[PDB]
Amino acid sequence: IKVRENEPFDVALRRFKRSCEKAGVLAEVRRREFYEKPTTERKRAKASAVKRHAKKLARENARRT
Amino acid sequence: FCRFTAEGVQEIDYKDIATLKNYITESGKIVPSRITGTRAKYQRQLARAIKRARYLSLLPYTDRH
Amino acid sequence: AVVKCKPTSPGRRHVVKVVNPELHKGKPFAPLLEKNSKSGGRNNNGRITTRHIGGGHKQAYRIVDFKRNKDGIPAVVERLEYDPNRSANIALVLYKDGERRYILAPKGLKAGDQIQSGVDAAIKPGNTLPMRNIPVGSTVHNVEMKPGKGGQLARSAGTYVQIVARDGAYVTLRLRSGEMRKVEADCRATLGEVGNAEHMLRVLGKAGAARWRGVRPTVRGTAMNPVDHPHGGGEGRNFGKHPVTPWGVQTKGKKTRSNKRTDKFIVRRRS
Amino acid sequence: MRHYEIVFMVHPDQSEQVPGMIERYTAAITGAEGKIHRLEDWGRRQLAYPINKLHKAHYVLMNVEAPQEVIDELETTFRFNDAVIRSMVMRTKHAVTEAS
Amino acid sequence: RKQVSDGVAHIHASFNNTIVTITDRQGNALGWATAGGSGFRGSRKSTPFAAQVAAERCADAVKEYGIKNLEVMVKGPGPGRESTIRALNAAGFRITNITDVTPIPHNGCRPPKKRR
Amino acid sequence: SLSTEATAKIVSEFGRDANDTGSTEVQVALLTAQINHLQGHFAEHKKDHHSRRGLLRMVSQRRKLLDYLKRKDVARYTQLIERLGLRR
RNA sequence: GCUUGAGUCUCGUAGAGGGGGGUAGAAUUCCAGGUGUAGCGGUGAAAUGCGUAGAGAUCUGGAGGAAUACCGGUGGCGAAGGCGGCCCCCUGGACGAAGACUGACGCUCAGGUGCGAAAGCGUGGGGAGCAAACAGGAUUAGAUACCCUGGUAGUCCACGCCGUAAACGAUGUCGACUUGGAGGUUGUGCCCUUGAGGCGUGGCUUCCGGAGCUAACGCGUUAAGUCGACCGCCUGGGGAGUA
RNA sequence: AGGAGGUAAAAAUGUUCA
Known part of the structure; x- marks a missing residue:
């Protein structure tokens, strides 16, 4: 949101902007209100997240590689 | 990973800006619990601490002031 | 209290009475009163300048202190009255030195409060x-x-x-x-x-209800002949004219504001 | 009676006239047997953000214990006194005395 | 003329265009250039290359003032936003500090439902 | 909502002593004390619907007890309704 | 009579539980003024629309209304509907701890009564944004739709009404019994807090799964498992949840 | 390994029984 690298930089190098928000919340408060999908798609979000966590502890098969 | 008042119990104060600014990014956002490794109970008091101190102009709402 | 009456007769079935039980049910303060005659809408020349005015119930004028020039003399609200010359109610206050005056009664002001x-x-x-x-x-x-x-x-x-x-x-x-x-x-x-903000909820009901307020029957210009009103004439409710007043001035959208000496104070016109 | 942790900031210029004020507010409180715990006057420090304009205001913490009636007496003297800007009262939790 | 030494460049990068203007530190504008006036009508109007020439044609018209160092305040998400500053870096100016002044609300007024 | 001293007053009054805190006489008077105090709350507001449901609960809890007391001991029941001021 | 049912009292704990009153910051729109100039906005493309009267952009200041970014998490609370910026006042419920007390006061409940998203209706205020209807421009064989620019009711507040939702874990309520694993959350006791802790004990809650159960899917100690008490409800499709 | 920005204007219909 604010960078200087005071004197010797000569290059953008601003990864700091994307680390805060800058676009994740703009392409969210851009449109599509709902008041419904939030609880729907985010209950959908971590539903699949726990199963990737499940097979994280479930890839102990052989498969030969 | 790290811990706080979870072991050495203490009440999170809002006048204490020293320990409070560790939980605030350069933008002026409240960091999530999924990073600082704090407990849920102490987190809520900490969230209330930020909102109280922000009202008393001790912490910025954003860095564009 | 916005209370709606019961239809015991036609013309009483629509009436909505606004009653306030705190209003003094006696007589007003005699010294602060003075007579107030009815004009009938007739000026010095005796001609009716403002139409639809006459009759009504006889009422007396209660001299109300709008000025409020007293400084630092705490008064107490004695009782709330009914004023037939206002829209709001008047509070009869009592000062410290024994002076009694009538003032407009604000919203939150019950008999027994202290003002200054x-x-x-x-x-x-x-x-x-x-x-x-x-x-x-x-x-x-x-x-x-x-x-x-x-x-x-x-x-x-x-x-x-x-x-x-x-x-x-x-x-x-x-x-x-x-x-x-x-x-x-x-x-x-x-x-x-x-105070008395529930005044606008009151509906008159009877035609006579308006007649004793002083108002008088208003006749539509379309019903008249062309010699009386710009509208007039017709052989079956014809109009075909741009709406105007009885004096040929365009009504329904035509600003009549022209002071110019007071527009210096007026910033923004209503909308 | 309940404890309170009121915090009120005063205008910079009016900070030269503030000391007498603290003793004025406390007088009415102890007049009603309200016990005082702290009286920590922080001092004129920087306002993180502009408040109605003009930053760098003067902070005053009181930390009072008093009856419920005298506080609305006290907070009404905050709304209508434009010298003091942005007041705030809080909860008890057995008022303390040490931190700064 | 006035010969202003320093200046602040502003970049309003939206999803269908980018209007980059150059002002001084006091806010009074001294010239601008859009991707919509550099030709590019339609699909090319929302491209980083169009943001490049916009920064170039804004590098001109401010020559009368000739500002050395430049503060950069980019605003809004979109196709430009980054190609406008790299083009402005090679424009010859001295980029002092780049900042992001995106207008993020705290759940204020309600955004449209459009798009299907 | 019944401060501790008010609770202590009624409990040692309608029963045997401070030890007596669970008897039926004690309960009815103590509940009535809360309802009489809560009557002031719903005098104004009129729309605090959630807390009201808490009131109606203790109302019927009182009525469950009184119907028990009458069914078990009409003697003390008659003396309780006259000392508390209810039961038409 | 008695106590393991039920309920009460003393001490503490967590929470978007509820009602009322103030307050704050970002942002949107609008208004006034300075700088400055041909586009702006929109889209698959485009056009209507806004614009040389001088927009958009930028800076300063002002007025309003509504919603509360981050924290925020298959996290918490509530009977359900549902409720989250901050603070104050009034106030409900739930849980835990070591005890005392009353002594079956209980479970359920046709009819009855109350609460009950949204939309809608009435009276009176308010009205930024969003947006039915409507209009215009496109798309199209047509487009009274999808998309775009505008836009009224409505959405907000107070007081009444309506009583309906896929009001749904599509699973009625209370109570007892029947292998475990891993997390979340909130109380509690003991041990060396010897160091982000170790071992038991309660409530709520999520995922995976054993027996059993099921038409199968799946449920699986918060059961659709094994039983008990009461209530509501179903009897082929359509007609019709209509006359 | 863990998280953010970007990624399809238009295309209707198919007689009856077996």
């Missing part, structure tokens, strides 16, 4: 004090235009003006209609709003 005027007034409803002592954003009523003039704006039932900004010697108020006037800072204003 002057620059040493605490910010409490009923208290009158110059506008550079009243906080900006506050709600006032019975506000003046000229210092010590008296108070003209916001005087009817449930009315109030809002102090929206203050710069130097001129304080801008937002009137009840939406106008944004400017005013001298020495103008005294009374805190709170004007």
